[PDB]
Amino acid sequence: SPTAAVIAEVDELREKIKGSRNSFRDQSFLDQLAQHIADAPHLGRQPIARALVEDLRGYASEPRLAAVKAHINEERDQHIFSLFDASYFPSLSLEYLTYETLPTNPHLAARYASPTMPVNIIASSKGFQSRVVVALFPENHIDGIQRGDDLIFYFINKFVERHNRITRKMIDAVMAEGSFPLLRGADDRTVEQASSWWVRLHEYHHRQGDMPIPEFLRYKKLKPLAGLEELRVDVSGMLVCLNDPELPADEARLAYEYILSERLLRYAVEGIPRPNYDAVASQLLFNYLSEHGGIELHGGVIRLCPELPAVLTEFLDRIQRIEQRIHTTSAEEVQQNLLEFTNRYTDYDPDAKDYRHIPFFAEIKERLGV
Amino acid sequence: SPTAAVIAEVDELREKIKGSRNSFRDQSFLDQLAQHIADAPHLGRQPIARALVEDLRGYASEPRLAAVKAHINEERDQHIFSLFDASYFPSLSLEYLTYETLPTNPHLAARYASPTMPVNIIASSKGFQSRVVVALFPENHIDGIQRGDDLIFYFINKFVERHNRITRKMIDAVMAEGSFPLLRGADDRTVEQASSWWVRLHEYHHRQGDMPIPEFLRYKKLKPLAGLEELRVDVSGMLVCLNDPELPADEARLAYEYILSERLLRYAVEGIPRPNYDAVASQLLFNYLSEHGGIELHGGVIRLCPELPAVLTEFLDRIQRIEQRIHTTSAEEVQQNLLEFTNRYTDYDPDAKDYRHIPFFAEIKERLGV
Ligand SMILES: C[C@H](O)[C@H](O)[C@H]1CNc2nc(N)[nH]c(=O)c2N1
Ligand SMILES: C[C@H](O)[C@H](O)[C@H]1CNc2nc(N)[nH]c(=O)c2N1
Ligand SMILES: CC[C@H](C)[C@H](N)C(=O)O
Ligand SMILES: CC[C@H](C)[C@H](N)C(=O)O
Ligand SMILES: [Fe+2]
Ligand SMILES: [Fe+2]
Known part of the structure; x- marks a missing residue:
């Protein structure tokens, strides 16, 4: 499975960085993390991984994950990949998932509109498999930023x-x-x-x-x-x-x-x-x-x-x-x-x-x- | 068992009164509960049950379970039977247990003396089977009273x-x-x-x-x-x-x-x-x-x-x-x-x-x- 090979790479990087949450915004750590993502045989090829690598490499000047979030929010594909720091979802660090969207009633989506994405997880790295993690919010990314139009995910x-x-x-x-x-x-x-x-x-x-x-x-x-x-x-x-x-x-x-x-x-x-x-x-x-x-x-x-x-x-x-x-x-x-x-x-x-x-x-x- | 018969009778009364906690100090309720206890073929003849019946019948003028607590504190036998109201032990209503005492180190009990009873539960009514209920304190009885020399039980x-x-x-x-x-x-x-x-x-x-x-x-x-x-x-x-x-x-x-x-x-x-x-x-x-x-x-x-x-x-x-x-x-x-x-x-x-x-x-x- 191509997706299993990608997730295996994320899970192994996740293991290596498990003791380093205090360094998740240190640029020395971020440079090393970014380099390891870039060199991952299967993960590194992915557009969303290239976006994160760019965000991480630039974090000392722009502490934002703008490229990753632009990819996600535009639904350039159905992958989510980032570095997370959500105190109430402690299992999340470096994580990856693929999702599938659910049908929506047109009137509901129009009259009660919000940037909400009710999805099923198809495959995911280990942090997303915790029963605690039932959703994903924009401020869960390390940059801690949320905008009113950022997509919010629920794992239905x-x-x-x-x-x-x-x-x-x-x-x-x-x-x-x-x-x-x-x-x-x-x-x-x-x-x-x-x-x-x-x-x-x-x-x-x-x-x-x-x-x-x-x-x-x-x-x-x-x-x-x-x-x-x-x-x-x-x-x-x-x-x-x-x-x-x-x-x-x-x-x-x-x-x-x-x-x-x-x-x-x-x-x-x-x-x-x-x-x-x-x-x-x-x-x-x-x-x-x-x-x-x-x-x-x-x-x-x-x-x-x-x-x-x-x-x-x-x-x-x-x-x-x-x-x-x-x-x-x-x-x-x-x-x-x-x-x-x-x-x-x-x-x-x-x-x-x-x-x-x-x-x-x-x-x-x-x-x-x- | 004779004890098995006693506890069956307690569990049956406990079931009958489960919806009535707001009446546990009402004398009309207590008069009826006391009568049913007294008439329980096995339970009603236990010395501790005679004590509880007397306390409950007198509760309108003496809101205390003095005869029951005297029996328990004097260790007249190894049975505990009472009507309980402990907000942190919500499973306890009308309950009965038999216990066994444990070896005690003389210096420990002398130098660090307290009215503590580390015991094992041998048999008990349903309320005492909750894993929440690890101990029993004097104020857990409906009278809500504790004295410094009341026995305190721990279910080791x-x-x-x-x-x-x-x-x-x-x-x-x-x-x-x-x-x-x-x-x-x-x-x-x-x-x-x-x-x-x-x-x-x-x-x-x-x-x-x-x-x-x-x-x-x-x-x-x-x-x-x-x-x-x-x-x-x-x-x-x-x-x-x-x-x-x-x-x-x-x-x-x-x-x-x-x-x-x-x-x-x-x-x-x-x-x-x-x-x-x-x-x-x-x-x-x-x-x-x-x-x-x-x-x-x-x-x-x-x-x-x-x-x-x-x-x-x-x-x-x-x-x-x-x-x-x-x-x-x-x-x-x-x-x-x-x-x-x-x-x-x-x-x-x-x-x-x-x-x-x-x-x-x-x-x-x-x-x-x-
Ligand atoms: C209201 C209560 O604080 C609850 O946990 C809120 C918290 N912040 C949230 N933020 C978003 N976008 N959606 C939600 O459902 C909630 N839940
Ligand atoms: C300290 C904390 O309030 C704890 O729950 C106390 C409460 N009251 C108690 N009261 C007695 N007699 N023994 C105890 O161990 C405790 N535990
Ligand atoms: C209703 C919002 C979320 C899903 C709910 N509070 C939960 O933690 O499951
Ligand atoms: C040691 C005090 C008690 C036993 C402890 N707080 C408990 O609820 O298990
Ligand atoms: Fe909410
Ligand atoms: Fe304590």
Whole structure:
């Protein structure tokens, strides 16, 4: 396999530089790395490798990976190759992958446009094989730069895997019979499509509203607030799938079921021993929906009420009322009010200043090992 | 078994009351629970069950489980049975176990005395089978009360299990040849004796120093500070094993190796996606020892320096210098200085106000699945 030969070369260079992350911007190291990439029999031939070599060789004057990113962003081919430094994707150093794109609904791509690339990984170097690495953002490159039109990649094959391994099991164990009818027995190509809708809507809505990110990112990194912002955009996407009549009805209801099942179940159990940011927000959703009539618990089993669309709309309306006050108060004051809202519906420990898994999902974590 | 019949009856009542935690102090609920316990053909006739029934029936005027705790604290037999409400042990509701005590070193128990009970669980109800539940504290009972002479139980069999599942594989992969020779191939009884020394020294040293717990507990629940207090006491126990000549020399060195291996390795990888309280402090230890000459990294593997006992003494001295200022400054000022010390040697994200696994242990988590 030609691609296996290329990836073998990347993986061997990756091994050699594993102890040198502190030198990844040192020009002496970069010159040596660049020279080794250039001399790699198969890798060095590749246009994208020549671009990186040029970027690396010039880094002391221009600390940018402009040529590599121009290649990627223009989709000159379906390869990604660069030097990465992403603190939350620690497995990534010198990495390579080949991807395949997924079909997109024309109305979705036009009306909710963003530079998002839902793809399947065909082959990749070792750092990309970690289950941690589910996406790739422009600032993950060593230059740390992101522009609004840089392509952002989501590895949909990994979300399909997570849905099949975790979400399906949770639907069967936690939800009333018939809760997610379109998802039952749905094949991978179907979940793949719904997942691609989900990430497209996710990226689009992050940039909408009165406190979009990246503009207000540094106010939305505390665990509960990072989770709440995730939930704001995924509820927004849920409601688009319910309300936008220009989306194909069958595909939109599937995407709705998918986003709802992911946020109501899989994300709700994430994190050990404490909920991570996604789980805090998903437990907020669980308790809000329970309290406000969107779901019901009958003997430990979740029923989706027919009124759930109205309650999801009320929930998003409530978040938007809190954020709208950015126009008349400080971002710090809005933060405090977002936290107060979160804490009314989660298990916040004031002395630890952190959260506990609410008992409902703690028991599910125990029962299913999730 | 008669015991098997008792526990079956407990598990069945536990199932009946699973949805009712919000009523666990309601007298109408307690009157009914007490009656069902009293009528349990096997469980109801146990002396500890008579004690719980009396406590529960009297709870409206005496919100304490005094008769149950008197039975347990006086070790009238080796059964534990109560109604529990421990937010960090959410699996515990109505629970029952039988335990076996372990050999005890006379000097250790006299010089470092505490009401600690290192025991093995022989049989138990479902709540006690959770791997989360490694110990049982007096305030875990629904009355929420603790007294300085209440017995505190540690389930040593679970620490043996964790040692053999995580620590052993970590020693092999991460430690230089010959780092922990007394632990190599050690049988479960040997690990059990080391673990019982560890928990005894742990409980003892929590009450020593200038900021002991429980007195200063509410200042030591923030994740980094909770971990740093764990590490203060375990480094103290480490040094006791090295320095106290009236402890048996073979058992003392074994306990030293055990405690060091647990804090250097097993606790260092705890928590997903972020380190938990133990892991933050263990990564503080790792980086402190690296920079101050107590360990060295050669080929991704940790060598323990002969000078390590002196560097551990320096580390504990440093913690004790910060805590000593409680006598001239506020608890809050001490907290800030404990955090500043922690953050110098850990990966703190100031925008998230939380920690990331340091790269050394992130890589080990990926490689070994820990
Ligand atoms: C909101 C929360 O901080 C969450 O992790 C954000 C972070 N930054 C992001 N940036 C982009 N482009 N897309 C995303 O989905 C997110 N997720
Ligand atoms: C230090 C940190 O708070 C840790 O979780 C403390 C908490 N309270 C405790 N209380 C007792 N009796 N024994 C312990 O070991 C601890 N651990
Ligand atoms: C919804 C955005 C991403 C995919 C999600 N927070 C995750 O880490 O899986
Ligand atoms: C040594 C204290 C306890 C055992 C440790 N923090 C744990 O949760 O395993
Ligand atoms: Fe996001
Ligand atoms: Fe402790």
